[model samples]
Target chain A: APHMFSIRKIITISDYVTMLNIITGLLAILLNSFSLIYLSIIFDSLDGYVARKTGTVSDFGAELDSISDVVSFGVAPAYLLYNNFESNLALISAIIFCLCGALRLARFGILNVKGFIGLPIPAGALLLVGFCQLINSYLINSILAILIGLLMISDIKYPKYPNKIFIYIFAVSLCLAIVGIPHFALMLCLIYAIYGIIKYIRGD
Target chain B: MFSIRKIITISDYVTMLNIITGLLAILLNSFSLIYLSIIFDSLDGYVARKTGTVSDFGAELDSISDVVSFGVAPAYLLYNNFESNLALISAIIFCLCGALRLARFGILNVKGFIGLPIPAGALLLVGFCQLINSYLINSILAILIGLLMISDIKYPKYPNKIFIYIFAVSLCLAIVGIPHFALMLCLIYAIYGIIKYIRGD
Candidate 1:
């Protein structure tokens, strides 16, 4: 019984990280702080890495992960966008982004395909955050938000970052977050998004 | 080569109505619109079953609509109501839990019920505001509702007559701008859950 409880406890660590990820995401929106959003992303990846490393992956864990992803990557970024720029267009664009993100996650859940069929919601969200940091152009941001939403649902194929590569990317992102710089992570996401778009256009 | 174009069905229209109302509810910042959205939410399935036009796409479409209507709309309402960090956090928790509950429902739907329904969860999130006006209480209730939504509690299905009565009441209340109606509806749901849970039904 003791051993069983411990195993259960170990498996649930990732779930707890997911809860924290959501909390950080809310703070990110409310405080208008991209740093917290960055932190939340870290937790997001950490939970998966922990789950995979500990060999405690479960259906419940995977489901919880996606739900948290929707809140953090979908709702939080959209809320951030709307609050930053108050307009009917902003509101509609935000809703589209969130809906597309949810649909993308849902598709991922159903298919369980190798390599992402479209831009992952988390990457799309990071791109938004990066754009927010880099530009004050309302029209451009609104256009990009819609574009990101479309990218999530498109037939574009995004290659998965292997565990080793993901860890390195996370480390680079972590360092950027520590220094209060989101541009690096944002640039990384931007490159990834553009790569997928180009790859889709090339039909390769 | 019988038909090159895809023809939309009645059930899809009802589902689309739910989605549109949900989007409008957030833009309008109107709780009444959410109640209307809930009404459309109920009707889509009823009409689908009655019309015998249920399809896999319709079912998936309904879930997506509910996520927008029940999950995100209430969250926006709560977050917008209190411009505080706590409220924002609670709203996020509520939304995420509702999404997970829906995902679980889609994957492993039981014959009766294993947890609180998403509509009930949204109703509670909206209704509790009428009972308690404090931000802390509202936020706390949101978290509790989130937990309850994902809990494995057996809640009995409401009779169709009850839904009809509630819908009529909610419609009248919205028209009259009665603030306490949500509290009343929430109490009815809580009592039902408690009674069912106690009887072990």
Candidate 2:
């Protein structure tokens, strides 16, 4: 009983920071959704490290983080995306995307991320944000948004982490967007998709 | 005899600067500002690693700075490329995703991330926006990017296979009278993001 009590204490501490992370992210999503940019950024970064730094890391924290991500990253973004179009389908798609994102997080927690078998929801959301920013046409943007909603649960694999190529692509895509090259950005994503396919064929 | 913890000010000033720089870059929306933010972004971590200051504060600060500089700021810049409504919606979504990514990073105890980092997603926006591509093209790209974010698919860290798809897709978009030149840059990043992440892993 004593040992269990101690364990519970540690768990609480660990999850405390994790909970903060989730809370902050939720708030950030709220703020960002409302067009308040700066504070969200700060809150977003602080939660995780604080837990780690304080030596409060735990499984509970991890779980909390994922839940928060669903709210801040998945649900909030989907709502924002949907808000732009005011379509019933868009709202449904956003909810689907959020649900899928939660499913993905659960999968990640269970699998412990040996390797992601699909693009992570947050990344997908971020990419979605890019699309929303660069592309303004209703049919196209809404359609793409709906597609992104689908991709949330798709079985496509994503790159594990950052790489020079990804960075370069990011850099160039930024350049393109600035210079009015939204389609060009699409081409960039397609190129990477092709690379993934080719590698799969080659057993990479 | 002495307490270094108390001396900790602003949870690492350099990191704060990085975050500030990122926000500032979005307001400026220039290649130089973008590049400058990237450089600053790179420096905080490098400084921490080199100086052995890779504390929780530094790491946390670095990631936060990344989101601000790389994620939301870039999204804002990209959104500005389109109409205010489109830009606003996209910026909000991107910011949420980026924040979620960071939160996940902190919660998960894994050594490496399962998908693209928040910074990478942000960079994609910045790279694409710099070209100021047309609405039709940018819209499609936005959709794809959103899908990629939530996808559960695995992308290899090295020998990134996605470049071809990016090239083909972007090229196709360009051929349809989009800015091929700008698309080319994104293609290069498709390869670069994979490689960079791979090495870090």
Candidate 3:
């Protein structure tokens, strides 16, 4: 009974983080609490890592994680964008971005491909959120939002993690974000997304 | 080869009607319009299947129309009703889940589903809107309906008579302004789904 309880506890932890991500996402949208969205992203990463490390990787966990990600990374960021820029075009772009993000997540789940066919939804969210943090330009932000949405459903193949250096940089950027500086993470995500697109163009 | 006269079909017209009614429902804030959207949704497929004009293109078009009718329109309707930040997020989740399920169904082509259908999920949300009073409950119901839309539970297709009965009853409830009946009907579906899962039937 103790062992069974421990196993259940581990799965619960993963699910708890997922629930936290959604809560933070709601806070981020409703309260204009932008920092909470970043916190939710951290929680998003933690849930998977926790799930995998604790050996509680069930199909249920995986599906729940995806559903949570779409809410946290996809819808939350789109809501943030619409709040920041109340333009009709911005709203349309936000809707497109969320829809594409949803489609990308669904495709990733069903195909179970070795590498992502398009940009990961989390990365897309990071890029948008990062840009929003640094710039208050509505026109440019709307264009970037639309572009990122397009890239999500595009055929650009970005490797899971280009190298260990990429992970190192991501961690550093995340730390920077934690320290009240989020633009670094956003800039880093943008650079990586562009690099992947360029590499795809070159057929490498 | 590109004659305008040869372009549209009756099923396409039904599909178009589905999209328009959903948009109008959002604009009008009418629950009856939402119900009509669901009705048009059913009629489109029936018309397609009945006429033997169910092509791949038509199937793809229907999927897109479903997203607009059942996903985006209902979401807009909810947003208009609640007009709160939390409601907005819930609406987004509901819409995205519906879209994801529709996309998955298109790819799998399986006769039976591994989850609740998108229309049923949207219908449940539409039903809940009539009865829900609190923001917390609204958000929770929205997320629950959305997740169930994408959950991996096997669901058998309802018999045609069942669909007819439900539709007739739903119309009656809407007409009576007893929208709480929609919530009860939704609860029955949940019970049915749970029983089916337990029986492995």
Which candidate ranks first by DockQ, i.e. highest? 1
True contacts kept of each: 0.08, 0.01, 0.00
Let me know the TM-score candidate 3 reaches against the reference structure: 0.63
Model 3: CA > 4 A from native? A1-13, A162-165, A178-180, B1-159, B165-201
Q: Write the per-residue lDDT of candidate 2 for residues B121-168, one digit (tens) a residue.
A: 555665566565665455445544544443332333322446544544
- Write the residue-wise lDDT of candidate 3 on A1-204 in tens digits: 121112233334666666566556545654555677678768877788887887766554565566566556766677778778878777777766766665566456656558877888888988887777778887888888989988887778877754778777777777678567997788788788999889988888
> Pairs clashing in candidate 3?
none
TM-score top scorer: 1
True contacts kept of 2: 0.01
Provide TM-scores for the models.
0.82, 0.42, 0.63
Each candidate's clash count: 0, 110, 0
lDDT of 1 by residue, B1-201 (tens): 101013235986787677667766665666777777777888898899999988665676677777767877787778777668788878888977776677667666566555677877887777665446788889998898887777766665554796668756765585356737655665576668757666675
Clashing pairs in 1: none
TM-score of the B chain in each candidate versus the native B chain: 0.88, 0.67, 0.86
Worst 10 residues of 1 chain A by lDDT: A1-10
Q: Which CAPRI level is candidate 3?
A: incorrect
Q: What does candidate 3's lDDT look like per residue over B12-95, in tens digits?
A: 667667655654454345667767766787788889989987654456446655665576656655766778878888977777
What ranking of all candidate models by lDDT puts the best one first? 1, 3, 2
Compared with the true structure, what per-residue lDDT tens digits does model 2 show for residues A129-178? Answer: 55665666545655766666555444555576547777566556545544
